[PDB]
């Protein structure tokens, strides 16, 4: 059937699932941002800005 590196072509013209996809990505990029934040807040030391 499809080679591994083409599996996402299954969206080339399914505006619906293309948006479903793009939505999931945004979710992960937003998710990452949120949690990369918490990681810094759990380890950043404000004791000295100088």
């Amino acid at each position: 059937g499809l080679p591994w590196y083409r599996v996402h072509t299954v969206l080339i013209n399914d505006p619906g699932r293309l948006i479903a996809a793009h939505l999931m990505h945004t979710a992960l990029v937003a998710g990452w941002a949120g949690s990369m934040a918490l990681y810094e807040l759990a380890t950043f030391d404000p004791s000295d800005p100088v």
């Binding site: 404000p46 004791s47 000295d48 100088v50």
Partner: protein
């Protein structure tokens, strides 16, 4: 005057009495008549904790802090003699009373700083 019930739960119990704006007079001292303090009372308003200047000694200042415990700070019922001295000065000398209360305050970092706020 208010009864216990008239204060319970209001937090009013942790507040030293107050004098009105009027009362700005002066009390006389006989210097030949012993006097005592029937009731000293101290109510905290702020607790500042001097910060450690890190290794870089740069002079440290006191910083405000949040009161993590609650309204249990006040010292009340202090008592002792207020002897008059030869030079005409006065020195209070405490004997007994609720002269101390364990207080705990937090800081910028989140550090809890417990102290035994007292005047024993």
């Amino acid at each position: 005057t208010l009864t216990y019930d008239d204060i319970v739960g209001t937090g009013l119990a942790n507040k030293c009495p107050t004098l009105d704006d009027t009362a700005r007079g002066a009390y006389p001292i006989d210097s030949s008549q012993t006097y005592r303090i029937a009731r000293l009372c101290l109510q905290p308003t702020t607790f500042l904790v001097k910060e450690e200047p890190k290794n870089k000694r740069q002079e440290a200042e006191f910083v405000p802090t949040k009161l993590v415990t609650r309204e249990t700070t006040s010292l009340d019922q202090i008592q002792g003699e207020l002897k008059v001295n030869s030079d005409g000065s006065l020195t209070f000398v405490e004997e007994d009373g609720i002269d101390f209360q364990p207080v705990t305050v937090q800081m910028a970092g989140g550090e809890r700083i417990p102290l035994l706020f007292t005047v024993k």
